[PDB]
Write an enzyme that holds these catalytic residues in place. Structure first.
Site, short mmCIF file in Angstrom:
data_model
loop_
_atom_site.label_atom_id
_atom_site.label_comp_id
_atom_site.label_asym_id
_atom_site.label_seq_id
_atom_site.Cartn_x
_atom_site.Cartn_y
_atom_site.Cartn_z
N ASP A 16 0.77 -1.25 0.00
CA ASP A 16 0.00 0.00 0.00
C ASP A 16 0.80 1.29 0.00
O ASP A 16 0.13 2.34 0.22
CB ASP A 16 -1.04 -0.11 1.13
CG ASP A 16 -0.40 -0.24 2.47
OD1 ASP A 16 0.79 0.12 2.64
OD2 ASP A 16 -1.11 -0.78 3.35
N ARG A 30 0.41 6.83 0.23
CA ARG A 30 -0.23 5.73 0.95
C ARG A 30 -1.61 5.56 0.31
O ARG A 30 -2.33 6.56 0.19
CB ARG A 30 -0.31 6.04 2.43
CG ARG A 30 -1.10 5.08 3.30
CD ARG A 30 -0.46 3.73 3.41
NE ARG A 30 -1.16 2.88 4.36
CZ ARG A 30 -2.30 2.21 4.19
NH1 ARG A 30 -3.03 2.26 3.10
NH2 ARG A 30 -2.73 1.45 5.20
N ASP A 35 -5.70 -1.50 3.57
CA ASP A 35 -4.60 -1.98 4.37
C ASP A 35 -4.12 -3.35 3.86
O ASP A 35 -4.85 -4.34 3.97
CB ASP A 35 -4.82 -1.97 5.88
CG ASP A 35 -3.45 -2.14 6.57
OD1 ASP A 35 -2.38 -1.65 6.13
OD2 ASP A 35 -3.49 -2.85 7.58
N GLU A 38 1.50 -6.11 6.56
CA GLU A 38 2.80 -5.49 6.81
C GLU A 38 3.95 -6.41 6.43
O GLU A 38 3.83 -7.64 6.55
CB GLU A 38 2.98 -5.18 8.31
CG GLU A 38 4.16 -4.29 8.69
CD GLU A 38 4.18 -2.96 7.95
OE1 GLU A 38 3.22 -2.20 7.97
OE2 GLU A 38 5.27 -2.81 7.34
N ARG A 82 2.89 11.40 4.08
CA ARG A 82 2.56 10.60 2.88
C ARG A 82 1.30 11.14 2.24
O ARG A 82 0.37 11.41 2.98
CB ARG A 82 2.26 9.12 3.23
CG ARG A 82 3.52 8.50 3.88
CD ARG A 82 3.30 7.11 4.25
NE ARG A 82 2.31 6.83 5.25
CZ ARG A 82 1.93 5.60 5.64
NH1 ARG A 82 2.48 4.46 5.19
NH2 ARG A 82 0.94 5.51 6.53
#
Ligand SMILES: Cc1cn([C@H]2C[C@H](OP(=O)(O)O)[C@@H](COP(=O)(O)O)O2)c(=O)[nH]c1=O
Ligand SMILES: [Ca+2]
Length: 136
Positions: A16, A30, A35, A38, A82
């Site tokens: 992302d 972003r 989402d 990670e 961002r």
């Protein structure tokens, strides 16, 4: 109504987050309303589908002839500096592509940036119905 502006890929960072040259300056973007798992924070580790979400985005922006950014109507930058936008690769929204493929969840409906929330939610329900990736 929002409008798309051209941008040039610098580098895909992860599922992302992408770095683009926008209005002639390098900037980290972003993706709004999504989402992806990670892959760099020690807090989460390398979450499941992180690598796949990263590969998907990268493939999508690198292979594009044209990249466009579309800011929403609320805040345009997060606290990390961002840019918050919808990114398009050859007219296809990356944000939606990720959700549709089950490689992201719809998240962070923040500071009046929700124009495409319904559109995204529909794609997410479909990925869920199909038990794809994250939803498998
Ligand atoms: C998508 C989005 C994320 N963010 C923030 C919330 C989270 O901050 P915290 O770091 O304090 O949790 C983080 C989530 O992004 P990441 O998924 O890159 O970590 O960035 C916004 O502030 N606005 C947004 O629209
Ligand atoms: Ca993320």
């Amino acid at each position: 109504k929002l409008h798309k502006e051209p941008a040039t890929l610098i580098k895909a960072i992860d599922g992302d987050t992408v770095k683009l040259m926008y209005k002639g300056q390098p900037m980290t973007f972003r993706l709004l309303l999504v989402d992806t798992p990670e892959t760099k924070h020690p807090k989460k580790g390398v979450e499941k589908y992180g690598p796949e979400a990263s590969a998907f985005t990268k493939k999508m922006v690198e292979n594009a002839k044209k990249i466009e950014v579309e800011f929403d109507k609320g805040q345009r930058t997060d606290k990390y500096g961002r840019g918050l936008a919808y990114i398009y690769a050859d007219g296809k929204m990356v944000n939606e592509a990720l959700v549709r493929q089950g490689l992201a969840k719809v998240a962070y409906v923040y500071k009046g940036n929700n124009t495409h929330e319904q559109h995204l939610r529909k794609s997410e329900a479909q990925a869920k119905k199909e038990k794809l990736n994250i939803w498998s």
